[PDB]
Enzyme design. Structure first.
Site, PDB file in Angstrom:
ATOM      1  CG  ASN A 234      -3.395   5.908  12.753  1.00 21.51           C
ATOM      2  OD1 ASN A 234      -3.953   5.949  13.868  1.00 21.51           O
ATOM      3  ND2 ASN A 234      -3.954   5.289  11.683  1.00 21.51           N
TER       4      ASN A 234
ATOM      5  NE  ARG B 134       3.520 -34.238  -5.894  1.00 22.38           N
ATOM      6  CZ  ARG B 134       4.003 -34.522  -7.092  1.00 22.38           C
ATOM      7  NH1 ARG B 134       5.315 -34.606  -7.310  1.00 22.38           N
ATOM      8  NH2 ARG B 134       3.146 -34.692  -8.098  1.00 22.38           N
TER       9      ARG B 134
ATOM     10  CD  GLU C 235      -4.079 -28.082  -5.753  1.00 21.37           C
ATOM     11  OE1 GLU C 235      -4.586 -29.102  -6.194  1.00 21.37           O
ATOM     12  OE2 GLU C 235      -2.946 -28.031  -5.204  1.00 21.37           O
TER      13      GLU C 235
ATOM     14  CB  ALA D 245       0.696 -31.142 -10.207  1.00 22.58           C
TER      15      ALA D 245
ATOM     16  CG  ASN E 162       9.181   3.491  20.127  1.00 20.02           C
ATOM     17  OD1 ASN E 162       9.886   3.295  21.102  1.00 20.02           O
ATOM     18  ND2 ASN E 162       8.847   2.501  19.267  1.00 20.02           N
TER      19      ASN E 162
ATOM     20  CB  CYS F   5      -0.846   0.032   1.275  1.00 22.49           C
ATOM     21  SG  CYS F   5       0.204   0.218   2.767  1.00 22.49           S
TER      22      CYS F   5
ATOM     23  CB  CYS G  85       1.507 -12.741  -8.393  1.00 19.71           C
ATOM     24  SG  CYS G  85       1.945 -11.696  -6.910  1.00 19.71           S
TER      25      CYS G  85
ATOM     26  N   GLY H 186       7.745  10.425  20.053  1.00 23.45           N
ATOM     27  CA  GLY H 186       6.918  10.383  21.272  1.00 23.45           C
ATOM     28  C   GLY H 186       5.956   9.255  21.140  1.00 23.45           C
TER      29      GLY H 186
ATOM     30  CD  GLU I 174       4.393 -28.308  -7.035  1.00 20.53           C
ATOM     31  OE1 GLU I 174       4.397 -29.040  -8.055  1.00 20.53           O
ATOM     32  OE2 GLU I 174       3.815 -28.608  -5.960  1.00 20.53           O
TER      33      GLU I 174
ATOM     34  CB  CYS J 283       8.420  -9.602  -3.464  1.00 25.15           C
ATOM     35  SG  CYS J 283       8.043 -10.585  -5.031  1.00 25.15           S
TER      36      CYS J 283
HETATM   37  C1  LIG Z   1       5.189  -2.352  10.561  1.00 24.24           C
HETATM   38  C2  LIG Z   1       5.624  -1.794  11.888  1.00 24.24           C
HETATM   39  C3  LIG Z   1       6.870  -2.118  12.396  1.00 24.24           C
HETATM   40  C4  LIG Z   1       7.253  -1.562  13.649  1.00 24.24           C
HETATM   41  N1  LIG Z   1       8.493  -1.865  14.167  1.00 24.24           N
HETATM   42  C5  LIG Z   1       8.893  -1.387  15.410  1.00 24.24           C
HETATM   43  C6  LIG Z   1      10.149  -1.709  15.923  1.00 24.24           C
HETATM   44  O1  LIG Z   1      10.957  -2.473  15.330  1.00 24.24           O
HETATM   45  N2  LIG Z   1      10.475  -1.227  17.174  1.00 24.24           N
HETATM   46  C7  LIG Z   1       9.586  -0.416  17.875  1.00 24.24           C
HETATM   47  O2  LIG Z   1       9.881   0.076  18.973  1.00 24.24           O
HETATM   48  N3  LIG Z   1       8.375  -0.107  17.359  1.00 24.24           N
HETATM   49  C8  LIG Z   1       8.020  -0.562  16.137  1.00 24.24           C
HETATM   50  N4  LIG Z   1       6.787  -0.196  15.655  1.00 24.24           N
HETATM   51  C9  LIG Z   1       5.888   0.657  16.554  1.00 24.24           C
HETATM   52  C10 LIG Z   1       5.481   2.083  16.135  1.00 24.24           C
HETATM   53  O3  LIG Z   1       5.820   2.275  14.792  1.00 24.24           O
HETATM   54  C11 LIG Z   1       6.192   3.127  16.992  1.00 24.24           C
HETATM   55  O4  LIG Z   1       5.770   3.029  18.382  1.00 24.24           O
HETATM   56  C12 LIG Z   1       5.948   4.564  16.529  1.00 24.24           C
HETATM   57  O5  LIG Z   1       6.976   5.390  17.009  1.00 24.24           O
HETATM   58  C13 LIG Z   1       4.641   5.089  17.115  1.00 24.24           C
HETATM   59  O6  LIG Z   1       4.533   6.399  16.671  1.00 24.24           O
HETATM   60  P1  LIG Z   1       3.270   7.100  16.039  1.00 24.24           P
HETATM   61  O7  LIG Z   1       3.562   8.547  15.823  1.00 24.24           O
HETATM   62  O8  LIG Z   1       2.791   6.315  14.816  1.00 24.24           O
HETATM   63  O9  LIG Z   1       2.266   6.854  17.295  1.00 24.24           O
HETATM   64  P2  LIG Z   1       0.678   6.925  17.246  1.00 24.24           P
HETATM   65  O10 LIG Z   1       0.055   5.605  16.838  1.00 24.24           O
HETATM   66  O11 LIG Z   1       0.293   8.039  16.368  1.00 24.24           O
HETATM   67  O12 LIG Z   1       0.472   7.146  18.856  1.00 24.24           O
HETATM   68  C14 LIG Z   1       0.811   6.097  19.760  1.00 24.24           C
HETATM   69  C15 LIG Z   1       0.616   6.529  21.224  1.00 24.24           C
HETATM   70  O13 LIG Z   1       1.454   7.627  21.591  1.00 24.24           O
HETATM   71  C16 LIG Z   1       0.676   8.634  22.151  1.00 24.24           C
HETATM   72  N5  LIG Z   1       1.367   9.857  21.772  1.00 24.24           N
HETATM   73  C17 LIG Z   1       1.851  10.240  20.558  1.00 24.24           C
HETATM   74  N6  LIG Z   1       2.398  11.498  20.670  1.00 24.24           N
HETATM   75  C18 LIG Z   1       2.321  11.890  21.958  1.00 24.24           C
HETATM   76  C19 LIG Z   1       2.768  12.991  22.646  1.00 24.24           C
HETATM   77  N7  LIG Z   1       3.537  13.914  22.108  1.00 24.24           N
HETATM   78  N8  LIG Z   1       2.478  13.099  23.993  1.00 24.24           N
HETATM   79  C20 LIG Z   1       1.819  12.079  24.636  1.00 24.24           C
HETATM   80  N9  LIG Z   1       1.417  10.973  23.957  1.00 24.24           N
HETATM   81  C21 LIG Z   1       1.646  10.878  22.643  1.00 24.24           C
HETATM   82  C22 LIG Z   1      -0.706   8.488  21.532  1.00 24.24           C
HETATM   83  O14 LIG Z   1      -1.768   9.140  22.240  1.00 24.24           O
HETATM   84  C23 LIG Z   1      -0.833   7.013  21.414  1.00 24.24           C
HETATM   85  O15 LIG Z   1      -1.212   6.399  22.576  1.00 24.24           O
HETATM   86  C24 LIG Z   1       6.399  -0.715  14.402  1.00 24.24           C
HETATM   87  C25 LIG Z   1       5.155  -0.432  13.873  1.00 24.24           C
HETATM   88  C26 LIG Z   1       4.777  -0.962  12.636  1.00 24.24           C
HETATM   89  C27 LIG Z   1       3.430  -0.565  12.148  1.00 24.24           C
HETATM   90  N1  LIG Z   2       4.674 -16.366  -8.986  1.00 26.69           N
HETATM   91  C1  LIG Z   2       4.197 -17.574  -8.670  1.00 26.69           C
HETATM   92  N2  LIG Z   2       4.903 -18.707  -8.972  1.00 26.69           N
HETATM   93  C2  LIG Z   2       4.356 -19.894  -8.612  1.00 26.69           C
HETATM   94  C3  LIG Z   2       3.138 -19.992  -7.889  1.00 26.69           C
HETATM   95  C4  LIG Z   2       2.465 -18.793  -7.592  1.00 26.69           C
HETATM   96  O1  LIG Z   2       1.319 -18.784  -7.016  1.00 26.69           O
HETATM   97  N3  LIG Z   2       3.048 -17.623  -8.012  1.00 26.69           N
HETATM   98  N4  LIG Z   2       2.599 -21.224  -7.514  1.00 26.69           N
HETATM   99  C5  LIG Z   2       3.526 -22.365  -7.502  1.00 26.69           C
HETATM  100  C6  LIG Z   2       2.788 -23.721  -7.402  1.00 26.69           C
HETATM  101  S1  LIG Z   2       2.185 -24.269  -5.901  1.00 26.69           S
HETATM  102  C7  LIG Z   2       2.555 -24.435  -8.520  1.00 26.69           C
HETATM  103  S2  LIG Z   2       1.938 -26.039  -8.425  1.00 26.69           S
HETATM  104  C8  LIG Z   2       2.860 -23.837  -9.869  1.00 26.69           C
HETATM  105  C9  LIG Z   2       1.635 -23.747 -10.760  1.00 26.69           C
HETATM  106  O2  LIG Z   2       2.054 -23.379 -12.093  1.00 26.69           O
HETATM  107  P1  LIG Z   2       2.546 -24.240 -13.334  1.00 26.69           P
HETATM  108  O3  LIG Z   2       1.806 -25.567 -13.280  1.00 26.69           O
HETATM  109  O4  LIG Z   2       2.195 -23.353 -14.531  1.00 26.69           O
HETATM  110  O5  LIG Z   2       4.023 -24.228 -13.083  1.00 26.69           O
HETATM  111  O6  LIG Z   2       3.509 -22.563  -9.918  1.00 26.69           O
HETATM  112  C10 LIG Z   2       4.348 -22.311  -8.810  1.00 26.69           C
HETATM  113  N5  LIG Z   2       5.041 -21.016  -8.931  1.00 26.69           N
HETATM  114  N1  LIG Z   3       0.921 -28.469  -6.803  1.00 29.50           N
HETATM  115  C1  LIG Z   3       0.093 -28.947  -6.342  1.00 29.50           C
HETATM  116  C2  LIG Z   3      -0.221 -30.525  -6.298  1.00 29.50           C
HETATM  117  C3  LIG Z   3      -1.622 -30.844  -6.422  1.00 29.50           C
HETATM  118  C4  LIG Z   3      -2.057 -32.149  -6.564  1.00 29.50           C
HETATM  119  C5  LIG Z   3      -3.503 -32.301  -6.526  1.00 29.50           C
HETATM  120  N2  LIG Z   3      -4.333 -31.237  -6.596  1.00 29.50           N
HETATM  121  N3  LIG Z   3      -5.683 -31.698  -6.498  1.00 29.50           N
HETATM  122  C6  LIG Z   3      -5.573 -33.039  -6.366  1.00 29.50           C
HETATM  123  C7  LIG Z   3      -6.726 -33.945  -6.227  1.00 29.50           C
HETATM  124  C8  LIG Z   3      -6.495 -35.182  -5.658  1.00 29.50           C
HETATM  125  C9  LIG Z   3      -7.548 -36.074  -5.495  1.00 29.50           C
HETATM  126  O1  LIG Z   3      -7.251 -37.284  -4.905  1.00 29.50           O
HETATM  127  N4  LIG Z   3      -8.813 -35.729  -5.915  1.00 29.50           N
HETATM  128  C10 LIG Z   3      -9.069 -34.512  -6.499  1.00 29.50           C
HETATM  129  O2  LIG Z   3     -10.352 -34.179  -6.923  1.00 29.50           O
HETATM  130  C11 LIG Z   3      -8.004 -33.586  -6.655  1.00 29.50           C
HETATM  131  N5  LIG Z   3      -4.253 -33.413  -6.359  1.00 29.50           N
HETATM  132  C12 LIG Z   3      -1.164 -33.197  -6.728  1.00 29.50           C
HETATM  133  C13 LIG Z   3       0.218 -32.921  -6.741  1.00 29.50           C
HETATM  134  O3  LIG Z   3       1.014 -34.035  -6.920  1.00 29.50           O
HETATM  135  N6  LIG Z   3       0.729 -31.627  -6.603  1.00 29.50           N
HETATM  136  S1  FES Z   4       5.527 -10.435  -7.600  1.00 35.53           S
HETATM  137 FE1  FES Z   4       4.100 -11.676  -6.412  1.00 35.53          FE
HETATM  138  S2  FES Z   4       4.330 -10.853  -4.356  1.00 35.53           S
HETATM  139 FE2  FES Z   4       5.905  -9.865  -5.524  1.00 35.53          FE
HETATM  140  S1  FES Z   5      -1.184  -3.173   3.351  1.00 31.27           S
HETATM  141 FE1  FES Z   5      -0.072  -1.570   4.242  1.00 31.27          FE
HETATM  142  S2  FES Z   5       1.817  -2.465   4.718  1.00 31.27           S
HETATM  143 FE2  FES Z   5       0.634  -4.211   4.106  1.00 31.27          FE
END
Ligand SMILES: Cc1cc2nc3c(=O)[nH]c(=O)nc-3n(C[C@H](O)[C@H](O)[C@H](O)COP(=O)(O)OP(=O)(O)OC[C@H]3O[C@@H](n4cnc5c(N)ncnc54)[C@H](O)[C@@H]3O)c2cc1C
Ligand SMILES: Nc1nc2c(c(=O)[nH]1)N[C@H]1C(S)=C(S)[C@@H](COP(=O)(O)O)O[C@H]1N2
Ligand SMILES: N#Cc1cc(-c2n[nH]c(C3=CC(=O)NC(=O)C3)n2)cc(=O)[nH]1
Ligand code: FES
Ligand code: FES
Ligand SMILES: N#Cc1cc(-c2n[nH]c(C3=CC(=O)NC(=O)C3)n2)cc(=O)[nH]1
Ligand code: MOS
Ligand SMILES: [Ca+2]
Ligand SMILES: [Ca+2]
Lengths: 1293, 99, 50
Positions: free
Chosen positions: A233, A846, A768, A1045, A323, A49, A111, A321, A1227, A146
């Site tokens: 947030n 398998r 599947e 498969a 954090n 996102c 994908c 703050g 696979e 990814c």
């Molecule tokens: C994907 C992801 C990974 C993360 N990884 C880590 C990590 O590795 N380590 C880690 O420590 N954290 C991690 N975090 C936590 C978070 O990101 C942090 O705590 C961040 O600093 C919060 O800040 P914010 O501005 O978003 O807080 P908000 O969500 O906006 O606020 C959080 C709290 O702080 C209070 N607050 C904010 N500003 C003030 C203020 N000035 N005075 C009083 N209260 C206040 C709010 O009222 C609320 O309760 C992660 C979060 C995510 C989503």
């Molecule tokens: N990018 C990508 N590759 C993938 C997958 C997928 O979902 N995404 N599925 C895997 C699995 S579980 C299988 S069985 C096969 C299905 O594709 P194929 O029969 O065309 O190889 O792709 C494999 N590689």
């Molecule tokens: N990849 C993946 C992977 C899939 C499968 C497999 N997918 N569906 C089924 C079914 C089995 C069955 O007994 N009845 C059914 O209707 C379907 N087998 C076999 C495999 O060897 N690799």
């Molecule tokens: S290309 Fe499939 S998750 Fe990245």
């Molecule tokens: S949808 Fe926002 S980080 Fe996964």
């Protein structure tokens, strides 16, 4: 106030009624129709996102650009901000931006669901640094995930921005030109002039005040003390979405100058509390470059934590703050702030105080000593003094974007020029429900000197003072305790070094090094096409996935991206919170009261059959009893997805528990199996065992795996209103079963139901069958309402409900000669199948088929049992039982090498099958290419030279070890039930000569359609530009087997080939009459002549049909082979490791598309590395999943892949058994990721020789996944010894 | 279909050719991705020409199902269709006619 | 056809046709049309991409 004004891709958005709960992602997708930005998790972990934000910073006096997670960004933070999405930077209808062009052409999209967010993270970097360094590039993606590509191509493509034939050509890449970038919105720049003012937004449930001044803030906190502050947030967004908190009043103080100021004072550097962590990071980095090392010790601790904190998206909006005041027990910052006595300036209306953060500041779980009226204004991070040293350490499950297991800040202050401790502060997260200081341990050391006795005393004190009871939240008791000591040891050694100026004690020096990146090297080797081949024959050429440019541009449509009908409704599943219970009653009375509520659906509503599932095992909606956490009971349908969600949460189920059976163990002990034992026995085991020199037996466990496709399950169902007709748009690999399960549930003929699959954002086996869980519920809602209905799962629902890979538990015994030669083997396999049969039996088969890997074993018996448990039903996951079995085989093989005291590669080689031998299931190995893969990989990886380098490294390093392992694999190609190996195709040629191909297979990122197009174009002898594939649908190709498969290219390729031959036969007389005419002339003449330009094509794999009773007949049509050599370095003090280098040689015959096939090799590889080393699901003892999102479930990150990563496709190995001499690829390579696991095992063996053993032939058990927990705990030493298992009066002997 | 009863006639025709009841057959719509290059529905010849197209397709289905009918003379349509499917016999075809 | 539900973002088209049997088109003026609430665009020969 009321109006919210911002910009999206240069265009003004005036939102008159902003609801404070609206995130950007929802606004973009549902209000602005901009569907390139995706939902992948909703918790800031996956980056799908990712968008860019730009604003005028009137304080730096500058346009700034940063990235942010739209899923967590409240639109109410965005007043006067310009948003740029993937559609903001280019498109295939105008021109791709360089970032989009390169990721597509460099094969960095499969994908394609992660692509726009990774595009936006690279774009954001470029707008800040139009010529970045390689490291600034890798770092751009700490918050992007990814699942498909294995990361290598994305990085290798983007690297062309810094500073064998080839898969891509960087010289065709359009240069970046910053003068051509979208201009910052000029209206917004006019507005920077007007002084800002308080704004008020009002939504359904929440009022939001945007405070323009500090005085406004402190007035508002006096008037509304309960009001919740929000900045980034990134914590409140989670509490709201995932813990059902509602904060009816929000104050956002982000604009206030004093909360954003940075001051350089005599005592330290002071940041306003709203300063993003990215600003903090930039300021400290600049201080660290400018200032004497001795001033910056605390600063460098802060920096070391920020390196491993979330990613760019999070760090750019998360505030300092936020954090501190969140006060999570696992804050990585608060331990550092506390160890340092960092200064908090805390204010309220007419009050101001400044306190050093210390242990009293966090009195209890999630609380701080701020009063109801008080805000954190600013934070002073101190300068380090003479004689004062500082470290910070964080250990998690994965190094990048993870939540700390143990995290710490450590400070010592010595008497001037001495080693005599004046102050010591050891502060930890993850060891209690708040950040804590080991004051008792550290008090004992004041006046003591920095020496061995001090280290020993502190370790012993840490072991006593930071105890964990067996019941502690988070578990990993021994690991966590080991880590508190290990981190101290690192600090102790680092301080010794810093104390002695700057050779002191090598062997030990590496324990003191901070993590560091070696530069990436990546080589791909594949075969050129025969010299004379037409440029229009693309078979064997590295053609990019046909949809890659549209994936990069956000224009590719995935199910939820399809526009809603105006009367379309939204379904939310109601699922069991109990593992095993009777349903006593269901109360919908609170749900009925949520606005937009429409209906609650349950079992009684179904007009046809409630019996569903592959084995007619399951309910569509649970009736009477629930048999797992996540068992679907019902569904709420409402006017928006939020109304549906809220309504479902408040549906009240009353249960009476029944005894549960959760584990493989429980199920064994309770005789709880699906069906009866499966077995393949060949030769004579007793005779085998009696003739073996040695016999090892043991027990092995491999944990399961969540598919983590970036697009979760999603169905749209359109009821027509006529004859029960329904049309569904579905993310599934199996349109056939979807169609028939929807017809079965409705009680209508299958001819009434049309299923359409355009593409999936990944499937990996998880679509599947389990996709019908959502499909059939949505169908029921469409039938019951007469409206279109849709549902896309949130990540957490997806992980709970839809099933994963099968956990396996193996009991084995292998008899072998002193030379390593395997003589006999028995393995009994048990899989955890969950609460229905689904594909479990075929999965076990398998497994049995692959229990040999590549090894000739004359006396062999394998059995399998399916454990019937109260867990969500597990299903297909790439490898489909193969990887479990093959992992079991390599574990005992590796134990064989150890027991013999022989080099592992010798023992593997001498056991290896040869050309023409029969497998244990009596299939002949014809064109067995593993020896050539093996020989080439030994050589191109320089294995033998590197072995000797690994031993040397190990001799010279006490607290880090390297490991090296090379493993083969073979993978049988066909579905094992003969009936599924059939494929149809439908081909039309229109009268302009354009061709539309349809086939039974689906696109999930693997490039099946691209391959089908390459085939059709070679068959017909026309360019691919004339051929097109729109989608997969049940009214074009009926009765299709799931896309599975790995045979889809094989079998659809043949069906498409055959329809092309028919077309060519029909056209031949027009070709004769007019030899010099065009394809177009011939088509038009056949049309004018009333010759049909439409045909089907079909194919059925010959000569298949294995019998378990005769143990004979072909199980597979052929096998795909390859070999991988991986090297790792582990950190024996923490359980972190680095993947230094992997080399893969894979036999995919004559590749149809080496770009696509290498992509499949690397993606599968990386998915297997995840399974064997990173990814782990945890359940409470009563069967409720803990790990429901990327915060806790850690798949490979960009930083996880081997730093040097080489892939070769075997030259000159045509496969006469498949279309154009190619082989199935999807696979087979995934089990090659196990080379990482076995390299790790080798490195553990080394560490245990260092500090555990004189026993070179000892066999310790290492289960999968080998996570930091298991690696660390396996590095038995003086620290593990102090904090093991759980003084007695009371000792026998 | 424009009111003239062509889908109805076509279902009548297929039912007679396959010797199954009209209730097991359905026509949902006309689309360029299932039948390409169609002449306009016109000159009153649609029953004549699509009737033969439908009839030839039904013949092809009958030839493919015959060995299963032969092996199981007392079975249902449903038995023969499932057997062909389990035996990997294609159950899709085109049909075509030229006056 | 028209009984088919509209998408939430679905728009409506109205043809603009000649009131003369045979005549040159001198100009076309859309300025009053643009004032009508909900106007999205007026399409003419120049908008055709093929
Ligand atoms: C994907 C992801 C990974 C993360 N990884 C880590 C990590 O590795 N380590 C880690 O420590 N954290 C991690 N975090 C936590 C978070 O990101 C942090 O705590 C961040 O600093 C919060 O800040 P914010 O501005 O978003 O807080 P908000 O969500 O906006 O606020 C959080 C709290 O702080 C209070 N607050 C904010 N500003 C003030 C203020 N000035 N005075 C009083 N209260 C206040 C709010 O009222 C609320 O309760 C992660 C979060 C995510 C989503
Ligand atoms: N990018 C990508 N590759 C993938 C997958 C997928 O979902 N995404 N599925 C895997 C699995 S579980 C299988 S069985 C096969 C299905 O594709 P194929 O029969 O065309 O190889 O792709 C494999 N590689
Ligand atoms: N990849 C993946 C992977 C899939 C499968 C497999 N997918 N569906 C089924 C079914 C089995 C069955 O007994 N009845 C059914 O209707 C379907 N087998 C076999 C495999 O060897 N690799
Ligand atoms: S290309 Fe499939 S998750 Fe990245
Ligand atoms: S949808 Fe926002 S980080 Fe996964
Ligand atoms: N009813 C009705 C009706 C229609 C037609 C007819 N319809 N299309 C044409 C065309 C003639 C041609 O030269 N080029 C074309 O593309 C079409 N003829 C004949 C008739 O006898 N009855
Ligand atoms: O679908 Mo594949 S495991
Ligand atoms: Ca799943
Ligand atoms: Ca199952």
């Amino acid at each position: 106030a009321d109006e919210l004004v911002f910009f999206v891709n240069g265009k003004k958005v005036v939102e008159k009624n902003a609801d404070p709960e609206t995130t950007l992602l929802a606004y973009l997708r549902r209000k602005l129709g901009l569907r390139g930005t995706k939902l992948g998790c909703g918790e800031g972990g996956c980056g799908a996102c990712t968008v860019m934000l730009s604003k005028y910073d009137r304080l730096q006096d500058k346009i700034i650009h940063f990235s942010a997670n739209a899923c967590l960004a409240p639109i109410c933070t965005l007043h006067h901000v310009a948003v740029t999405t993937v559609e903001g930077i280019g498109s295939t209808k105008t021109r791709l931006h360089p970032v989009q062009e390169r990721i597509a052409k460099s094969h960095g999209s499969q994908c394609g669901f992660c692509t726009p967010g990774i595009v936006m993270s690279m774009y954001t970097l470029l707008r800040n640094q139009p010529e970045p360094t390689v490291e600034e590039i890798e770092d751009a993606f700490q918050g992007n995930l990814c699942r498909c590509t294995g990361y290598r191509p994305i990085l290798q493509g983007f690297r062309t921005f810094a500073k064998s034939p080839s898969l891509f050509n960087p010289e065709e890449f359009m240069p970046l030109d910053p003068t051509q970038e979208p201009i910052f919105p000029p209206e917004l720049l006019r507005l920077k002039d007007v002084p800002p003012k308080q704004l008020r937004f009002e939504g359904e449930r929440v009022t939001w005040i945007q405070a323009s001044t500090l005085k406004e803030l402190l007035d508002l906190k006096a008037q509304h003390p309960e009001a919740k502050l929000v900045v980034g947030n990134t914590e409140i967004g989670i509490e709201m979405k995932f813990k059902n908190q509602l904060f009816p009043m929000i104050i956002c103080p982000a604009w206030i100058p004093e909360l954003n100021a940075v001051e350089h004072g005599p005592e330290g550097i002071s940041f306003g509390a709203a300063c993003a962590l990215s600003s903090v990071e930039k300021t400290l980095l600049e201080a660290v470059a400018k200032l004497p090392t001795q001033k910056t010790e605390v600063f460098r601790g802060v920096l070391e934590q920020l390196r491993w904190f979330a990613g760019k998206q999070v760090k750019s909006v998360a505030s300092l703050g936020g954090n501190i005041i969140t006060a999570s027990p696992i804050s990585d910052l608060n331990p550092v702030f506390m160890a340092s006595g960092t200064k908090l300036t805390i204010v309220s209306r007419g009050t101001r105080r400044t306190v050093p953060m210390d242990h009293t500041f966090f009195p209890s779980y999630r609380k701080t000593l701020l009063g109801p009226e008080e805000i954190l204004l600013s934070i002073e991070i101190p300068y380090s003094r003479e004689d004062e040293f500082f470290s910070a350490f964080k250990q998690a499950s994965r190094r990048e974007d993870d939540i700390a297991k143990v995290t710490c800040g450590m400070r010592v202050l010595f008497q001037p020029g001495s080693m005599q401790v004046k102050e010591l502060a050891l502060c930890y997260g993850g060891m209690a429900d708040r950040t804590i200081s080991a004051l008792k341990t550290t008090q004992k050391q004041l006046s003591k000197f920095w020496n061995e006795k001090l280290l020993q005393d502190v370790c012993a004190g840490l072991a006593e003072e930071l105890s964990l009871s067996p019941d502690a939240p988070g578990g990993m008791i021994e690991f966590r305790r080991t880590l508190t000591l290990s981190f101290f040891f690192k600090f102790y050694l680092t301080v010794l070094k810093k104390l002695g100026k700057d050779k002191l004690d090598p062997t030990y020096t590496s324990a003191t090094l901070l993590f560091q990146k070696h530069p990436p090297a990546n080589i791909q080797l594949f075969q050129e096409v025969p010299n004379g081949q037409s440029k229009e024959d693309t078979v064997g050429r590295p053609l990019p996935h046909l949809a890659a440019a549209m994936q990069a541009s956000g224009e590719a449509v995935y199910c939820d991206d399809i526009p809603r009908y105006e009367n379309e409704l939204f379904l939310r599943l109601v699922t069991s919170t109990r593992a095993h219970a009777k349903i006593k009653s269901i109360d919908v009375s609170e749900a009925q009261k949520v606005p937009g509520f429409v209906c609650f659906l349950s079992a009684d509503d179904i007009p046809g059959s409630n019996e569903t599932g592959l084995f007619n095992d399951e309910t569509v909606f649970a009736k009477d009893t629930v048999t797992c956490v996540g068992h679907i009971i019902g569904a709420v349908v409402a006017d928006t997805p939020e109304h549906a969600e809220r309504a479902a949460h408040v549906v009240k189920v009353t249960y009476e528990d029944l005894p549960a059976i959760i584990t493989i163990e429980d199920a064994i002990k309770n005789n709880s199996f699906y069906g009866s034992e499966l077995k393949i026995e060949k030769g004579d085991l007793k005779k085998g065992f009696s003739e073996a020199d040695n016999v090892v037996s043991g027990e092995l466990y491999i944990g399961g795996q969540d598919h983590f496709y970036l697009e979760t399950h999603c169905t749209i169902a359109i009821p027509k209103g006529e004859e029960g007709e329904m049309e569904l748009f579905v993310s599934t690999q199996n349109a056939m079963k979807t169609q028939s399960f929807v017809a079965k549930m409705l009680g209508v003929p299958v001819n009434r139901i049309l299923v359409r699959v355009k593409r999936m954002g990944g499937g990996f086996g998880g679509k599947e069958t389990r996709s019908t869980l959502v499909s059939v519920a949505v169908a029921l809602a469409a039938y019951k309402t007469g409206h279109p209905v849709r549902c896309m799962l949130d990540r957490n629902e997806d992980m709970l409900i839809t099933g994963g890979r099968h956990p396996f538990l193996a009991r084995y015994k292998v008899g072998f000669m002193k030379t390593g030669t395997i003589v006999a083997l028995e393995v009994d396999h048990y899989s955890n199948a969950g609460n229905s049969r689904d594909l479990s039996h075929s999965i076990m088969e398998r497994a049995l088929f692959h229990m040999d890997n590549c090894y000739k074993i004359p006396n062999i018996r394998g059995t399998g049992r399916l454990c019937k448990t109260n867990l969500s039903s597990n299903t297909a996951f790439r490898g489909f039982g193969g990887p479990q079995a093959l992992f079991i085989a390599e574990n005992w093989m590796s134990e064989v090498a150890v027991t013999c005291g022989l080099p592992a590669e010798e023992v593997r080689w001498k056991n290896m099958y040869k050309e023409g031998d029969l497998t244990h299931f009596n299939q002949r190995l014809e064109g067995f290419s593993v020896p050539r893969c093996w020989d080439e990989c030994l050589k191109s990886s320089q294995y033998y030279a590197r072995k000797s380098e690994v031993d040397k490294f190990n001799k010279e390093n006490c607290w880090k070890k390297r490991g090296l392992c090379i493993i083969p694999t073979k993978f049988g190609i066909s579905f094992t039930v003969p009936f599924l190996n059939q494929a149809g195709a439908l081909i039309h040629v229109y009268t302009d000569g354009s061709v539309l191909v349809s086939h039974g297979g689906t696109e999930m990122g693997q490039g099946l359609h691209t391959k089908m197009v390459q085939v059709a174009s070679k068959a017909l002898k026309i360019p691919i530009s004339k051929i097109y594939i729109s989608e997969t649908s049940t009214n074009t190709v009926p009765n299709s087997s799931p896309t599975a498969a790995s045979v889809s290219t094989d079998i659809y390729g043949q069906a498409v080939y055959e329809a092309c031959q028919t077309i060519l036969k029909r056209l031949e007389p027009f070709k004769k009459k007019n030899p010099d005419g065009s394809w177009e002339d011939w088509v038009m003449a056949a049309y004018q002549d009333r010759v049909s330009l439409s045909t089907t094509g079909f194919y059925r794999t010959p000569n298949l049909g294995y019998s378990f009773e005769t143990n004979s007949g072909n199980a597979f049509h052929y096998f795909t082979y390859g070999v991988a050599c991986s090297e790792v370095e582990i950190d024996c003090l923490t359980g972190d490791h680095k993947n230094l280098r992997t080399d893969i040689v894979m036999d995919v015959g004559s590749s149809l598309n080496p770009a696509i096939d290498i992509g499949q090799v690397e993606g599968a590889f990386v998915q297997g590395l995840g399974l064997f080393t990173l990814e782990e699901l945890h359940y409470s003892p009563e069967g409720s999943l803990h790990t429901r999102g990327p915060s806790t479930y850690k798949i490979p990150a960009f930083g996880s892949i081997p730093t040097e990563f080489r892939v070769s496709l075997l030259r000159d190995c045509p496969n006469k058994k498949a279309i154009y001499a190619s082989k199935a690829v999807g696979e087979p390579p995934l089990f090659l990721g196990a080379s990482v696991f076995f390299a790790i095992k080798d490195a553990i063996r080394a560490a245990r020789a260092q500090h555990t053993n004189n026993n070179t032939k000892e066999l310790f058990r290492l289960d999968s996944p080998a996570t930091p927990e298991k690696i660390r705990n396996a590095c038995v030493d003086k620290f593990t010894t102090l904090c093991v298992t759980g003084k007695p009066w009371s000792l026998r002997v």
